[PDB]
């Protein structure tokens, strides 16, 4: 395995851990805030993904400091990951156009 491919793999593993830990902690931050809805694990899990993907429907979102601090980590994980895959694909493609020119 080439590095770009390892780091994407690493980032996909690490993204999943962030999505799960994120779900757990979002519920743990958000319970105790009256009106908070991000307060059960299953939909937390859905929230974490709609967050890391930057889709962000807003059906759900945090309203407490630590919710928001957890949310900011999920986003960054999301964006970094979905930009290391791109960087990896860009390096795979560049490699293949180098061979198709003889280099």
């Amino acid at each position: 395995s080439a590095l770009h491919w390892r780091a994407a793999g690493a980032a996909t593993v690490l993204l999943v851990i962030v999505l799960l830990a994120g779900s757990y902690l979002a519920v743990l931050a958000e319970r105790g805030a009256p009106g908070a809805q991000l307060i059960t694990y299953p939909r937390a899990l859905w929230w974490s993904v709609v967050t890391a993907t930057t889709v962000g429907y807003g059906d759900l979102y945090p309203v407490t400091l630590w919710g928001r601090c957890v949310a900011v980590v999920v986003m960054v994980a999301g964006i970094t990951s979905f930009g290391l895959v791109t960087a990896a694909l860009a390096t795979w493609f560049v490699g293949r156009e180098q061979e198709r020119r003889g280099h």
Partner: antibody, heavy 118, light 106 residues
């Protein structure tokens, strides 16, 4: 196998305090919340508070006076609720109940009848 | 804090007849309503979760229905064992809240 095990009764002198136990058997998870629910005679169910024994965080009913303080013993699988400086208002049955963090109370204890008198 | 309203408080029905209990949320809670039975001197017992879903253990005689603000627990053909106090309970917004309850009476 009875999952939530609670004392039948505690007598308490007005002004005094009391620690209610709730020993849990069956599947435990990290995810699990223990809840406490107050029922005065001929009245209905009131949500007091919740604790997650794994991380030890608890939350309580703002909407009522904050008599209670919640604790767990990770090792002995027990939740405690500490009701302090009681009066006859506080004379009720206190149920504990297990919620998997998915919103419903799947299982309840038999509750503890707490009587505040001299 | 979401307000659960159970009218009527008492429900008089005849043996084997269909009965329905109403639970109205002060604001849309989706399907995040749960129904409990409490007989005299008993602890509460989950009948229905997320408005409609059966609990295994519970007679098929029991159903729920509803979305948003209007919810309904129904018993097709009531019998004596059904005599108890019914409560609804929301999980949609912190903190969880309970209905004031309704007495089934044959």
């Amino acid at each position: 196998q009875v999952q939530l095990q609670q004392p039948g009764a505690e007598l308490v002198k007005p002004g005094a305090s009391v620690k209610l136990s709730c020993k849990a058997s069956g599947y435990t998870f990290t995810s699990d919340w223990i809840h406490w629910v107050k029922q005065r005679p001929g009245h209905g169910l009131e949500w007091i508070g919740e604790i997650i024994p794994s991380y030890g965080r608890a939350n309580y009913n703002e909407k009522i006076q904050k008599k209670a303080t919640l604790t767990a013993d990770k090792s002995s699988s027990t939740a405690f609720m500490q009701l302090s400086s009681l009066t006859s208002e506080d004379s009720a049955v206190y149920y504990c109940a297990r919620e998997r963090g998915d919103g419903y109370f799947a299982v309840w204890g038999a509750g503890t009848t707490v009587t505040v008198s001299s | 804090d979401i307000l659960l309203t159970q009218s009527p408080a008492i429900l008089s029905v005849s043996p084997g007849e269909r009965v329905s209990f109403s639970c109205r949320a002060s604001q849309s809670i989706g399907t995040d309503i749960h129904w409990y039975q409490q007989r005299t001197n008993g602890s509460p017992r989950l009948l229905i979760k997320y408005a409609s879903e059966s609990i295994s253990g519970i007679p098929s005689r029991f159903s729920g229905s509803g979305s948003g603000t209007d919810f309904t627990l129904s018993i097709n053909s009531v019998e004596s064992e059904d005599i108890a106090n019914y409560y609804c309970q929301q999980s949609n917004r912190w903190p969880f809240t309970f209905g004031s309850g309704t007495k089934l009476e044959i």
